[PDB]
Design a binder for this molecule. Structure first.
Ligand SMILES: CN1CCN(c2ccccc2C/N=N\C(N)=S)CC1
Ligand SMILES: CN1CCN(c2ccccc2C/N=N\C(N)=S)CC1
Ligand SMILES: C[As](C)(=O)[O-]
Ligand SMILES: C[As](C)(=O)[O-]
Ligand SMILES: [Ca+2]
Ligand SMILES: [Ca+2]
Ligand SMILES: [Ca+2]
Ligand SMILES: [Ca+2]
Lengths: 88, 88
């Protein structure tokens, strides 16, 4: 189904970026940026400034370890989905 | 992108079922059941007993109004995605 395809897409895209550098199960600043710029180009403005990268990570980093884990990525997805939902 | 397609799939499948009966922005017991049975047939066991329907709603119903709204649906999706993530 389309729902099951959406579940596996969330897992795959996270790992496409998290496993690039350092901890393979977390997104660092540069990995989060590329994910937003390449995969969310219709929902979000392209990030071109360092302070936007820093602010976005600050917002998503719930436990405060400097990176975005899978749970925090899921919360980010929930935010975008809710913002898009309320648009209509 | 695949991620953006996943975001719109979550919104669409929720409304496919929530808008069937009663409140068009919330899932009642029978609507939640059909969503699980039709759209999550590879991730979850088919619900065939009433007490399984009742228990699942009890688990998902965070604010305690008897139904599953969009925020609660997103938390449900997060649960399944995390369970599938940890499987590998
Ligand atoms: C600069 N933009 C271009 C992408 N946009 C957008 C694009 C398509 C459909 C809906 C939205 C609307 N709204 N919100 C989100 N995507 S979070 C708006 C922001
Ligand atoms: C009775 N089942 C059939 C569907 N399953 C399943 C199917 C495919 C890939 C991974 C899982 C594994 N694990 N978890 C979830 N889907 S939440 C297991 C449960
Ligand atoms: C850790 As690699 C070689 O997939 O960027
Ligand atoms: C409320 As209807 C007619 O789409 O089931
Ligand atoms: Ca990483
Ligand atoms: Ca973190
Ligand atoms: Ca309803
Ligand atoms: Ca509720």
């Amino acid at each position: 189904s389309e729902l099951e395809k959406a579940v596996v897409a969330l897992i795959d895209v996270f790992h496409q970026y998290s496993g690039r550098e350092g901890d393979k199960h977390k997104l660092k600043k540069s990995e989060l940026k590329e994910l937003i710029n390449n995969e969310l180009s219709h929902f979000l403005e392209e990030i071109k400034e360092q302070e936007v990268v820093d602010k976005v990570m600050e917002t998503l980093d719930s436990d405060g370890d400097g990176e975005c884990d899978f749970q925090e990525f899921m919360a980010f997805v929930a935010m975008i989905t809710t913002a898009c939902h309320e648009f209509f």
